[PDB]
Design a protein around this nucleic acid. Sequence first.
DNA 1: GTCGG
DNA 2: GCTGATGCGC
DNA 3: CCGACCGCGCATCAGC
Length: 326
Amino acid sequence: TLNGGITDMLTELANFEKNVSQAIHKYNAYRKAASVIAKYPHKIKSGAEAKKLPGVGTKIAEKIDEFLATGKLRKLEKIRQDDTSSSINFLTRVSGIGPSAARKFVDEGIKTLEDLRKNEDKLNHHQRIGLKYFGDFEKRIPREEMLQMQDIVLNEVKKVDSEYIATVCGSFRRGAESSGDMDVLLTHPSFTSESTKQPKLLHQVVEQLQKVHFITDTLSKGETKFMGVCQLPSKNDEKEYPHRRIDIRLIPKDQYYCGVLYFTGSDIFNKNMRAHALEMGFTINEYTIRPLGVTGVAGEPLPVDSEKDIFDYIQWKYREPKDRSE
DNA sequence: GTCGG
DNA sequence: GCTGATGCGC
DNA sequence: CCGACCGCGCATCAGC
Ligand SMILES: Nc1nc2c(ncn2[C@H]2C[C@H](O)[C@@H](COP(=O)(O)OP(=O)(O)[C@H](F)P(=O)(O)O)O2)c(=O)[nH]1
Ligand SMILES: [Cl-]
Ligand SMILES: [Cl-]
Ligand SMILES: [Cl-]
Ligand SMILES: [Mg+2]
Ligand code: NA
Ligand code: NA
Ligand code: NA
C-alpha cells in the first residue's frame, strides 16, 4: 500500500484496456507495471524514478508524473464520464460477462443491474448465477472462513475415497489473510498421465459436496475442471454466510508439482515464470516442464519431484508461496 | 504499453 | 455428431 | 524500429 495511489490508477487503466478496448496486451502491460511498482519498497517520488523499473516505460512515466502532481489522471476522469465505457466496465463485473458480451448488451440498452434482472431470459447459465450472487462474489473471504471451508472440503473428500488428496491453493496457499475465492487441487492415484483407471473421479467429489449443501451452484463442469459456488453453513438463527466462488481442478497424480505450482499462482507470477522459462528454453504448463528444440517444438516431460526442481530447471532460486504474490 | 533483438 | 475458433475465466 | 507478449478447460457457436 506504499504506492497505493499509483497502482490503483494503473489497475484502472488495465481494466479499461481489457474491458472497453479489448486490448489484452495493454491490459497485461498495465498489470505488470502495477505489479512491479507494488513490490518496490520506496514511496515513488517521480515518473522517471519509476521508469527505472522493468515494465514502466515512457507513457506510464508521464502518467505517474501527472498523478503525483494533481492526484488525478485526466485520461481516467474522462473514461468515467463516457457512459458507454462505464456501462461496459460495470457489466464485466458479472461473472460470465466478458468484454464482448458487455458491449453487446449495452448495444441493446441492457446497461445496469435492473436491466440485467429484467432480461435473465437473455443470459446463459454462467451469467445467471453471476448476476444471482453478484454482490456476494465481490466480498472477500476472511482466512478463518477459508480454514472452515478447507475442512469441509478435505473431510468430505476423505469420505468419498480415502486416497483423494485435496490441496487448497490460490492466495490461501500464499498465506493471504483474505481470498477472493477458493481453489482446490484434487489428485486421486487412479488418474495419472498414464491412465484414467476410474471414471467420474471429479463428479463424485462435487456430488458429495452437493449432498451436504456446501456446493450450491455450478457454472461449468468437465471431467477435470469444476467451476461453481459454495457457502459455509451457519448454526441456529445467524445470518447466512455469503456465497463463494469455488474451483476444483483434477490434475494427474504424477503431475502434482506442476499442478500445484500453476494453482498457487499468482496469475502474474505464473505469467512471468512461464515467460522466463521460454527465455531459458523451457515451456511450463500445469502438467509438465519440457525443453524447446531449435524449431521451438516442445520436447518431452522433464522429470519433476518437487516444486523446486521446476524452479531449478529455469535458473530461478526457489520462492516460497508467500513470495509469489506478484 | 513495454521490451529486447 | 465432430472439429475447430472464439469467449470467458482460471 | 517492431514483433512477441503463458497456457489451457469448458461453454458455445459455425461449418461440414
Ligand atoms: N498460468 C496462468 N495461471 C493463472 C492465470 N489466472 C489465474 N491462474 C492461476 C494462479 C492462481 O493463483 C489460481 C487461482 O486463480 P484465482 O483467480 O482464484 O487467483 P488467486 O491467486 O487465488 C487470487 F489472489 P484470489 O482469488 O485469492 O483473490 O489459478 C493465468 O492467466 N495464467
Ligand atoms: Cl493489445
Ligand atoms: Cl503437457
Ligand atoms: Cl509460503
Ligand atoms: Mg483464488
Ligand atoms: Na524500465
Ligand atoms: Na466478468
Ligand atoms: Na479461482
